Amino acid sequence: MRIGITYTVLRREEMAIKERAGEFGEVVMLHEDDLLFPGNYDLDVVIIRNVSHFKALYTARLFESEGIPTVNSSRLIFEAGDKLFATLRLAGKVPVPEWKAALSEGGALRVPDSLGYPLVSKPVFGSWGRLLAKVNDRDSLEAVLEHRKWMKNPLYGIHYFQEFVEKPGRDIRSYVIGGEFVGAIYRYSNHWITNTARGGKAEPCSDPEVEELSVKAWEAFGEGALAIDIFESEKGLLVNEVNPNMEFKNAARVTGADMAGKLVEYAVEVAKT
Template sequence: MTDAIALFTDGADWHAARLARAIERRGVECRRVSLNACGFAVGRTATGLHLPGFGDALPLGAFVRVVGQGSFEQVTLRLGVLHALDRLGVPVYNGARAIERCVDKSTTSFLLAQAGIPTPPAVAVQTADAARAAVEEWPDCVLKPLFGAQGRGLRRLSRPDEVPEPEAMAGVYYLQPFVPPLREGAWRDCRVFVVGGVAVAAMIRHGRSWITNVHQGARCEPFRPDGVVADLAVRAAAVVGADYAGVDLIAAPERDSDSGWLVLEVNSMPAWQGLQTVSDTDIAGCLADDFLRRVGAAALVRPQ
């Protein structure tokens, strides 16, 4: 075991730079590693893993900022490395299980509904005919990539003949009925940032269109992270097993939710650059504090 932690990221990431500084200010060495460069080395290293910069040693902990795009096989291998680190007693933040549950939007929807957390209906099917049947039932619905982020690839459908061919959706159609704004043209939703079971920051995102992601040009407005919104976000993060998460909520149409809100998504590798511009909370500092508490707690029970 080394005295350093691994920060899994790719390239010159604003978030990784903030995290590394926050961790090192707390007296712990932080080594940035790309999961693209990691793998297994069974019989070749003492750990059975190939972790650049660590040789035969294990990190004190692993903070997952980015898994990275890749083929199904590449992503499976990277998640396998995270599973292996967990098995070897290394605290992984977020762990592979939470990432798997969040990356697959259909699994997130299922788990939220099973836990009684208000969330829109959803279907995930593998044929265009089944998707067309869903559009027949929901004549105003949103088609999302099953694995997607930052508002990329979203489509709003109103007719069955608008359903694309399977190749355009990687063979899976994930659909939800469109949640209309409370006032026409007032496109907005809420992002709550949860760290260690606490809602530490929040914002309202005002979209230029019905897609309200910051990367799609949304304007950020401060929002107090408390009350029912905070409670729903914390519960949603716990349901998927996330140490930290960006939880997206939207105001529910009348009678769709007793809480007045619906949880849309739980993001296990959330960005917070936009949120930081409207929040007084040092988000990277909150993440570093909670992560290092986990690392310290694991060290107390780890065999010496």
């Protein structure tokens, strides 16, 4: 067994992954500088851990082109990592917040017609609560769309919105790896954006309802290791987002769950094919 790990920096998650991988075989640490394709790699599986979402996606695809399976796969990284492609796959399978998508500034102006105010604006490829906006009226919608318009990245021209969900000072982060629920936490904040990357505080979550919903959300995709984001609302639990390059150092610390170990065990299962 030769297990590759691709990485930008080695965060606590990557060091834990490395340790666990070493229990199952030889570990090859592959910084981005070490990635050059086409190339000659002797690897049974690669665990994709690049901090950049787009570098993760492309490095998965390139290893697949070399016949080396990858956790997560390029398909899952692309679909799960995009807010819009992901809600499309979740829709009809699990409950989700009300959402709307437009393809231009002029189309986006009509989004409140369906969703009302306040609504949430967010970029399709982001993470860590980046560029999330709570929009309470027309003037705010205009300001957000004016700024998106002048940003260089064409992806900011895909306009994705949700109803603002009134959560009870927290949201839920769960983990499902290969169909197995591995654990969940609450992320508490006195700001409506609860990411731990923005100061969110982890606490263990043991609601049996989130376990079943989490597994169903994972089954919408049918593969891989996913960190799933869930909201409590007056209409019950809603699946917001899924994430294909999970961070978990706070979640593992707070639950005792060995996310790293489970991730590596899944990687070893995919290596067998």
